Amino acid sequence: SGFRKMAFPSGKVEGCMVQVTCGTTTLNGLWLDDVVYCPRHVICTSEDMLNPNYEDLLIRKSNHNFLVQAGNVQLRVIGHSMQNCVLKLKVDTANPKTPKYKFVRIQPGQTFSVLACYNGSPSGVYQCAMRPNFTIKGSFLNGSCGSVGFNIDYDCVSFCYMHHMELPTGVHAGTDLEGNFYGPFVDRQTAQAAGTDTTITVNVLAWLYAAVINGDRWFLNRFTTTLNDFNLVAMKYNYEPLTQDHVDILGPLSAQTGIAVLDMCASLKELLQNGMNGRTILGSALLEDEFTPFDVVRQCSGVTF
Amino acid sequence: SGFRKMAFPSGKVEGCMVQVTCGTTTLNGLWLDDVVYCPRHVICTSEDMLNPNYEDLLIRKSNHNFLVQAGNVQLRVIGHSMQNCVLKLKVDTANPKTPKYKFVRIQPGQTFSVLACYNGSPSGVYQCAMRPNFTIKGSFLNGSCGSVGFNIDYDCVSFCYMHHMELPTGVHAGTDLEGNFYGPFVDRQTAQAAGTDTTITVNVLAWLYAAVINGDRWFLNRFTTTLNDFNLVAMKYNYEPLTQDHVDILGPLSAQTGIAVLDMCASLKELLQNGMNGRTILGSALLEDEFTPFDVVRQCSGVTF
Ligand SMILES: *CC(=O)N(c1ccc(-c2ccns2)cc1)[C@@H](C(=O)NC1CCC(F)(F)CC1)c1cnccn1
Numbered sequence: 219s220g221f222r223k224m225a226f227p228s229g230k231v232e233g234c235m236v237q238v239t240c241g242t243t244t245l246n247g248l249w250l251d252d253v254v255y256c257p258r259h260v261i262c263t264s265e266d267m268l269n270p271n272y273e274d275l276l277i278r279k280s281n282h283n284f285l286v287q288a289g290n291v292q293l294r295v296i297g298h299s300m301q302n303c304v305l306k307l308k309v310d311t312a313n314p315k316t317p318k319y320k321f322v323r324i325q326p327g328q329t330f331s332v333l334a335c336y337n338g339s340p341s342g343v344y345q346c347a348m349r350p351n352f353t354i355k356g357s358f359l360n361g362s363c364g365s366v367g368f369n370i371d372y373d374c375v376s377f378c379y380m381h382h383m384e385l386p387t388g389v390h391a392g393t394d395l396e397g398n399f400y401g402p403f404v405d406r407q408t409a410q411a412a413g414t415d416t417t418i419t420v421n422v423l424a425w426l427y428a429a430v431i432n433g434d435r436w437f438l439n440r441f442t443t444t445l446n447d448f449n450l451v452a453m454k455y456n457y458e459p460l461t462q463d464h465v466d467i468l469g470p471l472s473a474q475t476g477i478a479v480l481d482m483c484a485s486l487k488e489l490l491q492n493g494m495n496g497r498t499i500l501g502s503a504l505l506e507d508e509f510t511p512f513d514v515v516r517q518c519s520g521v522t523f
Numbered sequence: 524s525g526f527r528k529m530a531f532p533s534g535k536v537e538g539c540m541v542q543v544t545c546g547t548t549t550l551n552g553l554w555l556d557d558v559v560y561c562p563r564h565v566i567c568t569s570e571d572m573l574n575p576n577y578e579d580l581l582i583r584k585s586n587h588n589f590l591v592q593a594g595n596v597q598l599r600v601i602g603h604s605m606q607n608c609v610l611k612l613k614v615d616t617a618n619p620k621t622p623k624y625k626f627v628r629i630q631p632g633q634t635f636s637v638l639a640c641y642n643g644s645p646s647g648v649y650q651c652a653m654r655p656n657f658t659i660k661g662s663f664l665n666g667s668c669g670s671v672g673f674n675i676d677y678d679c680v681s682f683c684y685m686h687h688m689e690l691p692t693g694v695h696a697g698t699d700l701e702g703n704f705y706g707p708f709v710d711r712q713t714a715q716a717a718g719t720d721t722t723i724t725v726n727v728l729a730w731l732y733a734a735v736i737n738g739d740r741w742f743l744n745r746f747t748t749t750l751n752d753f754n755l756v757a758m759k760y761n762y763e764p765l766t767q768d769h770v771d772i773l774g775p776l777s778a779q780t781g782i783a784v785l786d787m788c789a790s791l792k793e794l795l796q797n798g799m800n801g802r803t804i805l806g807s808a809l810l811e812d813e814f815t816p817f818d819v820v821r822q823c824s825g826v827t828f
């Protein structure tokens with residue numbers, strides 16, 4: 219029993235974290251085989267940030283200008299290139315702790331674990347959702363850039379995020395491991411605000427299913443609804459449209475609890491219209507939307523890696 | 524910026540997790556040097572549970588009856604003994620991934636990371652507080668027993684908890700790594716309910732300081748209070764007494780924000796008496812008490828390991 223915001227075991231990612239320094243600036247790198255991936259703004263100074271010419275700046279850097287450290291051991295850089303907003307530093311030593319891995323670009327609404335690092339040393343692990351507005355609500359201080367987000371399926375680590383910058387609203391923007399930003403954000407000190415966010419409706423439904431499984435059932439009403447009628451209410455409360463794909467992905471939770479998805483939609487509709495009246499669901503006083511249907515399944519079936 | 528419920532990197536603990544099987548029952552073991560620590564109820568069957576005679580049951584077990592697996596590799600047991608509610612299985616191979624470690628008994632109100640495991644394989648990491656009633660609100664399914672709780676200071680892993688059982692209220696009970704239970708709980712299927720819990724006042728104050736640091740300042744009132752007057756209000760709302768020790772441990776957060784501890788107490792007093800009026804603090808609609816003053820400091824200073 220019990221439901222908790224749960225991260226993946228970070229051990230396989232800990233073994234890939236290195237420190238990258240180019241002159242003044244130091245941040246985190248991801249070491250897989252004989253390549254170190256890091257944000258390209260490592261080559262920017264405190265005076266380049268408004269609109270840095272990354273091509274020009276990189277040209278003036280040698281392999282020897284890049285100080286890469288795996289603990290107290292320096293890795294010799296023998297090649298460097300830029301792919302979008304990330305640098306790829308070729309080193310003469312392959313990471314002996316290189317796990318089975320993939321580079322994926324996740325969808326908005328999907329969740330991943332972040333290993334927060336400073337100077338190539340991991341500080342903590344936490345679970346994030348890619349927001350519909352293509353930001354993440356993380357915990358990142360100065361020198362956190364190059365920290366990665368990931369999912370694990372048995373033995374394979376799927377890297378989906380590398381941290382680049384914070385927006386003035388204190389939310390976070392980054393790239394896939396091909397260095398393409400999530401959302402319209404750019405790696406420079408410019409005027410860029412996140413679009414208005416929305417609640418991940420399918421995730422709220424998943425979390426309500428988690429509540430029932432854990433015996434927190436107070437909110438279940440005697441009603442049903444059409445998908446169309448639910449989505450008209452959802453729209454009013456800034457919830458994203460629930461699609462048949464969403465209904466289908468909720469099937470295992472519906473099968474386990476015996477509650478039809480449109481019946482759970484009816485209970486959610488009432489919670490949105492009437493509020494929670496000072497009550498809690500799984501120890502929360504508001505509706506939680508950063509648990510995917512698979513997150514709920516994993517935590518309620520005990521899938522290991 | 525940002526504040527998140529953050530676990531320690533689990534890598535050092537992942538390398539210590541093994542599977543222990545004695546006949547019918549399989550659970551998790553902690554492998555340090557040439558000793559495997561696990562709950563003693565591994566030697567109980569489904570018919571022994573009401574009041575198992577652990578001494579009698581253990582006597583009838585051989586070294587060879589204990590099947591210990593580190594992945595797919597069997598560890599040969601060459602000795603076994605019982606210390607309180609844990610077994611110590613001596614194996615012929617020392618764990619090559621044995622980190623620098625200690626066994627501590629934590630105080631109520633203190634926090635630690637849990638590495639949830641099944642069949643010696645880690646599923647997830649999450650942050651817990653030892654409740655004043657000596658339970659933890661974790662996420663544990665069948666076969667989770669032997670999963671450990673820990674803190675990390677630079678290189679040293681301090682093991683403070685091993686999971687044993689769930690209470691009918693869905694809260695969790697376990698032991699230190701000397702096998703002494705936290706609280707009055709026993710490893711058998713008996714009538715044992717957790718005493719009434721209380722809110723960890725010093726932790727709520729720490730979390731309010733975290734909010735101010737992150738720029739969530741709406742709740743700060745223009746008032747102060749005596750420690751004595753605060754504790755009379757706190758008592759009414761089932762908050763534990765705030766001691767001078769608690770005030771002293773909050774000093775760094777008071778120094779950083781410029782808010783005197785008794786001034787923060789005045790703002791907390793108003794929140795308790797008037798509620799939050801539908802508003803949130805660090806994205807929560809109720810007052811959070813599972814962040815220690817040091818947890819807030821670590822996450823707001825970026826301490827690595
Ligand atoms: C890398 C890092 O941790 N941070 C950072 C992001 C972006 C840049 C850029 C340089 C060129 N284009 S954008 C540099 C550094 C920090 C961060 O924003 N730190 C600032 C501190 C003040 C300053 F020095 F003036 C400018 C950098 C970061 C990232 N994520 C969260 C919080 N801080």
Ligand SMILES: *CC(=O)N(c1ccc(-c2ccns2)cc1)[C@@H](C(=O)NC1CCC(F)(F)CC1)c1cnccn1
Nearest residue numbers: 564567572663664665666667668687688689710711712
């Ligand atoms: C080890 C484990 O995961 N669990 C467990 C706890 C305690 C015992 C005891 C045996 C003798 N004294 S107490 C055995 C197993 C489970 C758990 O309680 N599983 C039960 C399932 C039904 C049953 F088989 F009839 C009896 C065991 C556990 C632990 N923590 C959370 C959830 N489940």
